């Protein structure tokens, strides 16, 4: 109905610095830096007082003011990802054949290999996106932890590792085997 | 209809403020209706207990601000879950009864307003 002014806010903590030329956002924090191209979404940014930034759209439709809250959530996710970090814990689920997961190196690229998923001879290799660190966690049986700054990279790597272990030609409500993400949170959760 | 019920609440509160000099602000957390009912019965003779939406109460006090100006002091204390006890008895006897009754695994008196004076107690 052409909402003539809608506007969201993002809060900037003390440690980070955000640089926005045209629609390219750079967020710099203690854990590092992240960048984002937003030239497809057509909003406007405005710094208020060096810890608050308003984002606004003028004369926008329903889809456009939906995209405004979307881009606010994206830049806020970037800020909280460079402050606290992002950590996804996944668990191994098997009935009979134990899933054997290691880290190998074809041409120095940090592959995650998955062996013996439902006893097959095929070896499933998923690549690792840059900026994502993977630790096979102790003291909890069969648990893998992916950590990083970018929620997109961490959650996409976790999703690729989940989708690589799909069961074919069986009832998947009975054959529940796989690697499933059980926890999503921050590296410095409850800071 | 909704407004009418609301109007009655405003009126009763005003009457209660006038009727009893001593006011006790009580905060209730995890107190069952049964727990509350028992307390009310024990104090029926000497005390009046009022529960209401805070937004509703604040407006009422502001509305009744010109009369009874000292009651304005109570407004900062109103924030958070609160209940109002209006009693003839001056202070400790009422307080002792409220805290003791129905402690289970818990009523607390956050503040006391008597005669235009506020006591943390």
């Amino acid at each position: 109905m052409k909402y003539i002014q809608t506007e969201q806010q993002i809060e900037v903590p003390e440690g980070v610095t955000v640089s926005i030329k045209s629609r390219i956002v750079k967020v710099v924090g203690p854990r590092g830096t992240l960048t984002k191209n937003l030239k497809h979404i057509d909003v406007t940014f405005t710094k208020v007082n060096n810890q608050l930034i308003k984002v606004a759209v003028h004369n926008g439709g329903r889809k456009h003011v939906a995209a405004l809250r979307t881009v606010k959530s994206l830049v806020d996710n970037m800020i909280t990802g460079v402050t606290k970090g992002y950590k996804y814990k996944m668990r191994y689920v098997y009935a009979h054949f134990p899933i054997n997961v290691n880290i190998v190196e074809k041409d120095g690229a940090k592959f995650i290999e998955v062996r013996n998923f439902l006893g097959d001879k095929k070896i499933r290799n998923v690549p690792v996106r840059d900026g994502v660190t993977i630790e096979f966690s102790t003291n909890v049986k069969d648990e893998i932890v992916l950590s990083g700054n970018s929620v997109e990279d961490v959650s996409q790597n976790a999703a690729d590792l989940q989708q690589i272990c799909r069961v074919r030609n069986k009832d998947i409500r009975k054959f529940l085997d796989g690697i499933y993400v059980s926890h999503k949170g921050f590296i410095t959760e409850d800071l | 209809g909704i407004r009418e019920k609301k109007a009655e609440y405003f009126a009763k509160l005003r009457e209660y403020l006038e009727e009893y000099k001593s006011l006790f602000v009580v905060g209730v957390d995890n107190v069952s209706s049964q727990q509350m009912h028992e307390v009310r019965k024990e104090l029926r003779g000497r005390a009046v207990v009022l529960m209401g939406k805070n937004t509703m109460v604040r407006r009422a006090i502001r509305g009744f601000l010109s009369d009874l100006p000292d009651f304005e002091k109570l407004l900062p204390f109103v924030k958070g879950n609160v209940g109002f006890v209006f009693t003839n008895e001056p202070l400790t006897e009422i307080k002792n009864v409220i805290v003791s009754n129905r402690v289970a695994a818990g009523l607390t008196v956050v503040q006391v307003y008597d005669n235009g004076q506020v006591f943390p107690s």
Binding site: R91, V93, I172, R173, L176, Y180, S182 | -
Partner: protein
Amino acid sequence: IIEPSLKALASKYNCDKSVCRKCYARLPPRATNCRKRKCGHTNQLRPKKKLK
């Protein structure tokens, strides 16, 4: 037997879904309309059939 908590975690992704009656799509359990274009975003949905 897997484990009770681990069966719950696997069934969260495999069994606790909904199925569109028109195009058989596997849908979120609290969904109201199908996300697919070919059925016309219909609201004819059923729970995914469990065992036992």
